[PDB]
Every structure is written in C-alpha cells, then in structure tokens.
C-alpha cells in the first residue's frame, strides 16, 4: 500500500527499494514573446531515483532535446520518467533490481505500472509523505551536472557522502530530508548555513561539506530553526 509515517521504518530494512521523484523532469522558464504572448523555454531536467537505504542515486539527466516536437509535454514527462526508470531496472542485475518502487507523486503510478508490466513482482507504490526531493536541484553539484549536459546522461552519486561510515540509514535519510526540506523552504538561508565557514570544504567526490559529528549537530539545529522560522512567516503564527 501507500507509504506514510506508520510504515516509515520499512525504508531501511534489507528489501531493495527506490524512490522516484519526477518533479524536475520537465523544467521551463516562462517569458513574453515579441508579440506579447507567453511562451515557455525548457531547460535540462532530471529523474531523481534514490535507494534510501544505501544512498545510491541514479540521476537520469533529461536533455531538452527529448521534448523537441512533442505536445502535452507535462503528460509526456510522466511516460518518459517511467520509460527511463524501467530501463534502469532492466539494466541492473537481477539481485540488484528493487522489490518496490515508491513514486513521490501519485500521477506516476499508471505510467510506471504500465512500463513495469514485465516485472509483475516489483510493487509500485504511492506515498502520503511530503518528501522534499524537488529541492534536489538546490544541491549545487547536481544542478551543475544537469545544466551542463549536452545529451541524455546517467550520473551516479551517493547522496549521503560517507555518512553511513558513522551513522545509520534511518539517520542519514533524516539528515538528507531535513537538509532538502530547509533548502526547499528558503534556499538562500539554507545555503548560507551550509557554507558560511570557509574552512569546511566539500570533497571532490561529495555533495555536502565534511562536517565533523559535532558540526552536523549544529547544522541540523540551524536547519531546524530555519524551517520553523519560515513556517511562522508563512501563516502568521
């Protein structure tokens, strides 16, 4: 069934499962034409597919070329997302294929399900959680590799850097989502917080600064405080 707070710790058992977020697959800018009508210009997009347990991310870059000459693009984006996820599953060895794929938006169920007809034993699941994975393009190195791409490309990351060397999956995923939640609600503040101190650098092979344990504690508190602050501003509380 649907993922929610009840069945939350299932994410971290030893059943391979992937999250698929499609919010960044079709990205446009909106602008005025010489005649004054509105027109859209697409930019490079991406499928965010993440194993919450292991941190393995399969960032499938979507090149603007894929839209060329197509109608009902926002509809098409869901079908292309499912097309790529399916091909990713087909590319994986059997023992690495997932037992479940959880889509962050309900509109992806039908296309995925149709594209996965060949894998009847992979469960496609919706979720009631409000995951912040749209903010993935606020991570500088991810937004950079997408924006530069000149062709469809798959790029592999571990979204957790080396955290698992020291903390559990559960904790890593909590940190991950806390950090993207913050980046989603106020990107400028969130980014300020992460990079204020120039002496804490990002390894070339990493996405996030090399905070020590005590420093992650301060960061997470700063991220928490940020998120509450913005809520009060949002609703006048």
């Amino acid at each position: 069934g649907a993922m929610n707070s009840s069945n939350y710790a299932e994410l971290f058992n030893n059943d391979i499962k992937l999250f698929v977020d499609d919010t960044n697959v079709y990205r446009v800018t909106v602008h005025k034409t010489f005649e004054g009508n509105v027109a859209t210009k697409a930019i490079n997009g991406c499928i965010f597919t993440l194993n919450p347990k292991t941190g393995h991310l399969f960032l499938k870059i979507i090149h603007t070329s894929v839209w060329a000459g197509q109608k009902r693009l926002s509809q098409l984006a869901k079908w292309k997302t499912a097309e790529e996820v399916s091909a990713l599953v087909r590319s994986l060895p059997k023992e690495e294929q997932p037992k479940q794929i959880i889509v962050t938006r309900k509109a992806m169920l039908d296309p995925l399900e149709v594209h996965m007809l060949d894998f009847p034993n992979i469960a496609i699941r919706p979720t009631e959680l409000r995951l912040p994975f749209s903010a993935a393009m606020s991570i500088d190195k991810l937004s950079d590799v997408v924006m530069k791409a000149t062709e469809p490309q798959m790029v592999l990351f571990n979204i957790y850097d080396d955290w698992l060397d020291r903390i559990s999956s559960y904790t890593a995923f909590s940190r991950l989502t806390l950090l993207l939640r913050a980046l989603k609600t106020n990107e400028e503040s969130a980014k300020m917080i992460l990079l204020s101190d120039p002496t804490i650098t990002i390894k070339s092979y990493h996405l996030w600064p090399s905070f020590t344990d005590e420093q992650w504690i301060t960061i997470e508190s700063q991220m928490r405080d940020l998120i509450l602050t913005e809520y009060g501003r949002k609703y006048n509380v």
């Binding site: 097309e83 149709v114 007809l117």
Partner: protein, 300 residues
C-alpha cells in the same frame, strides 16, 4: 409463439420473464408462461418471497427445445428442465392452456424494448460463458463470480466473460506503452474485435448479456464486465462509425430499462463521466448522453 409450463408453484415467489414479472402465492395454481416470442433469447428468473437475496434465473431459446419449470424441494429452487418427448410436452401445454392457468407474455406491439436489449445476444455465445453443456439453457444467480474475479474459486460455477485488463501485456504493445494506454484503439480493434470476438456483434452480444445479468440478478461481476466493455470503446480514438451509432442505441435502452432506484450500485460514476464527457467518444453518444442527463443528473 412458445410456452414454458410449470409443474407447480410450491412456494411464494416473484417470477420474472424478460423485463416482466408477477407475484405467485404459495401453492397458487400457476402453470407457466405462454405467448413467448420465438426469435430472441429469454430469461426466466426467480426471487423467493422468503429470501430476497439470491435472485436466479435461466437463459434460453425456445427454438432449441421444449423447456419447463419444476420446483425441487431438496435444492429448494425452481429448476429449468427439458422434455425430449414432443407429444408428451404438447400434451401438458395444451391442457394447462385449456384450463387457462398460464399468464401471457404481455408484449405491447409498439414495444421494441426486449429486442433492443438482446439484439446481439446469441444463446450459443451464452453457453460458452456459462459452461454446463448437458443443458440447452443456462443458469445464473446473484452470487456467481467471474473468471477475472476468480483470479484476483470453484470454476464450474464461473462466468467465463472475456477478460479485459487495461494494464496488461495484451493491451499494451512494448514501445507503444503511453500511446496504447491513452488510446486503446489497438486493444479494441486488433486484439479484441479481430482477435477474440471476431466481429462487433459478438462483442456487443457479450456486452448486453453482461448488462442483463447485472440488472436481473445484481451480479456484481456482470456489472464490472459491462463497464469494462463500454470503457474500452470510449477510450479508443478510432472506432468503426457503425459500432458508435449501435453503441449509443444499446446503452440508451439499457439506461432506459434500468430500475430508477438501483442507479447507485449499477452505474460506475467514473466510467460514465469518462465515456460522455472526457473520452474520445464524448460527442458520439447523443442519445445515451441525453437520457443520462434527464434521468440521473446526480451521478454526473
């Protein structure tokens, strides 16, 4: 004109014949239905005064033999049977008619209703959906499950309706995933019409039987099959123009014949709002749309 005699009426029961019905009192002297039009299929059906659950009935065709009804006290239901002995059968019919203990198939001559509801229904096709080849007539009741329902238990008592599934390899050509799921034309025209049903008339025949079973027995899987079949057409962008006009007529008369008080369980809100307003065929069910709006505006 044909006759279906009854041995007796031992228990109080509401007897239906096609869309007509009558109350018969316990051990009232009732002995059958006369003046039954030859040339179509018919359904005689039953609801005991004591158990309003379980409606049950038999589909038949008088051209295929001489059939009669006899209450079985062991099984506690009215059973259809065949007399092979013509003389002995004409003998029982003539006597009961002389004694005038039979009701007449009360057909108004202006009325094409039963014909429109059964136009494409053919007894041979029914006997493939209700397999019991020792009888020329077919039994159906409220509780019988379909084959597709049995997949998601006893197969002898199954409704072997043709299995339609929009999320199946059958319905979806590899590489035309998105195309085929939004525009089911492939599944309807090649897979189902040309492949399985062979022609529109068998398709339409199963569609109308599915409807009549949901209507006369509240057979929930029949309801599901009828809707599945409507949906497949209306979700197809490319349909023969003759099927569309015949479909509009078919649905019109089904919506017309439905009991007004049952529209809540028998009509699937999503399917109808799709056929009439969202689908490719939104513009192509003028009669069906007009009757749905003026009779069940709420469900829309």
């Amino acid at each position: 004109m044909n006759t279906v005699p009854f041995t007796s009426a031992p228990i109080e029961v509401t007897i239906g014949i096609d869309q007509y019905s009558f109350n018969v009192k316990e051990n009232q002297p009732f002995h059958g239905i006369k003046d039954i039009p030859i040339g179509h299929v018919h359904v005689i059906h039953f609801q005991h005064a004591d158990n309003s659950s379980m409606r049950y009935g038999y589909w038949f065709d008088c051209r295929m033999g001489n059939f009669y009804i006899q209450y079985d006290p062991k099984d506690g239901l009215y059973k259809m049977m065949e007399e092979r002995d013509g003389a002995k059968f004409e003998n029982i019919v003539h006597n009961f008619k002389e004694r005038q203990m039979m009701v007449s198939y009360p057909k108004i001559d202006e009325d094409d209703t039963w014909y429109n509801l059964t136009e494409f229904v053919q007894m041979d096709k029914i006997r493939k959906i209700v397999r019991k080849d020792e009888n020329q007539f077919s039994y159906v009741d409220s509780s019988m499950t379909t084959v597709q329902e049995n997949e998601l238990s006893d197969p002898a008592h199954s409704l072997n309706y043709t299995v339609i599934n929009f999320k199946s390899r059958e319905a979806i050509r590899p590489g035309h995933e998105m195309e085929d799921f939004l525009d089911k034309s492939y599944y309807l025209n090649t897979v189902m019409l040309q492949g399985i049903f062979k022609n529109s008339s068998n398709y339409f025949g199963e569609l109308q039987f599915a409807f009549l079973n949901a209507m006369f027995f509240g057979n929930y899987g029949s309801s599901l099959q009828w809707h599945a079949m409507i949906e497949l057409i209306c979700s197809s962008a490319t349909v023969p123009k003759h099927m569309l006009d015949k479909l509009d007529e078919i649905l019109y008369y089904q919506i017309k014949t439905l009991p007004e008080q049952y529209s809540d369980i028998l009509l699937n809100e999503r399917v109808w709002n799709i056929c009439l307003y969202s689908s490719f065929q939104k513009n192509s069910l003028h009669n069906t749309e007009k009757i749905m709006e003026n009779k069940y505006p709420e469900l829309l």
